[model samples]
Target: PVDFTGYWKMLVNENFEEYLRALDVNVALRKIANLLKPDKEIVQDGDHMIIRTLSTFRNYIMDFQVGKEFEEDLTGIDDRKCMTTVSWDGDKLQCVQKGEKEGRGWTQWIEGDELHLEMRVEGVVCKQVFKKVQHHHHH
Candidate 1:
């Protein structure tokens, strides 16, 4: 089993603002997100995982068990509610988020020890690549 348990820092972020706009992110948030680069951390404990997307202005965290469809409360991110299911598509983790907006989903895979994330909304796709940040444990 592949464990995506690490702190990852972004190396490249492409088409993120347009992808946010596809999700109907407000102009203000879009402006903020455009300039902001987020850090991603994934903690996997057995089949349960906690994925956190951290930024200065806001953060998005998802706690989920694999193969189970659960309610995803967007909170400060989208404020858009949804049901999400995460499943393994080969070595990649695929998430289908059924929400107010259609065509919303993401795929996460590891490419040569680096984490790759592709976020999709409607016709827009945002790709982010992150490298492992040295472990600095915290509460």
Candidate 2:
């Protein structure tokens, strides 16, 4: 099992604007979101998880358990609500968002020292890579 309990900094983002466009996001917000590099802070305990997307303009937080369905409010991103469920597929984390939009989902996995995220909506797919950030603590 892959432990995704760390701070990850965005390293590369591909086709993020296209993905947002598929979700019918406005041009103004899309431009601001595209330029910002968001950091991911994930804490996983057994089947429970808390994922936070932190950026300069906005922050989104999600708390859920594996194989359980819950209402997800995408406030900062699209201001939409959906029934979201997350499950584990091998070492990858698979998620599905049931809403008005079709084919909305995302997958996350850890590869080497980097975390890879693939976000999908309708026909557009955005790929993002994040490098693990090591925290130095002095006791």
Candidate 3:
């Protein structure tokens, strides 16, 4: 199965500050996140995923399965705690984060060899695109 489960380093994070800052997160929080390299190590088993966002000061860990309801601890990252669930809208993986931030969460998908992620918080949308790491895959 084609999945985004891997150790993905940040090749480029465009408009990251705009995304974070627009969320009404203070300058200090934005500064910390801006300088930090949050790496996503996603482990996919069937429809479930144990994803971890590794960073210097902050580490986010969450377990989720597609079409299954779950909880999300956004204390350290978004600082807004909530219940969250992710499901696939066609090929796009969508997350509906239920919390104080009105409409929140994101959608992620893979197009060809690139990874596309779109995040929206309080009506502010931030889009990021990343190139897939080159690998032979055929063994």
Task: Return the TM-score for each candidate structure.
Answer: 0.92, 0.94, 0.83
**TM-score rank, highest first?**
2, 1, 3
**Model 2 TM-score relative to the real fold:** 0.94
Candidate 2 runs further than 4 Å off:
136-139
Per-residue CA lDDT of model 3 for 1-139, tens digit only, reads: 4587766655666677777876677888888788876666677899988867667687778787788877777776666687888987887889998888878889988777667788888777877766655442221
lDDT of 2 by residue, 23-139 (tens): 888999999889999888889989999998887677889999999999998865787889999999999999999999999999999999999999999978999999999872221
Q: Candidate 1: where are CA atoms >4 Å away?
A: 135-139
Off by over 4 Å in 3: 134-139
Candidate 2 overall Cα lDDT vs. reference? 0.91
Model 1 lDDT tens row, 82-109? 8999999999999999988888899999
Q: Which candidate do you rate higher for lDDT, 1 or 3?
A: 1
- The lDDT per prediction is 0.86, 0.91, 0.75
Count the clashes in each prediction. Answer: 0, 0, 0
**Model 2 deviation from the true structure expressed as Cα RMSD, one decimal place:** 2.5
Q: Rank candidates by lDDT, best first.
A: 2, 1, 3
* Backbone clashes in model 3, listed as residue pairs: none
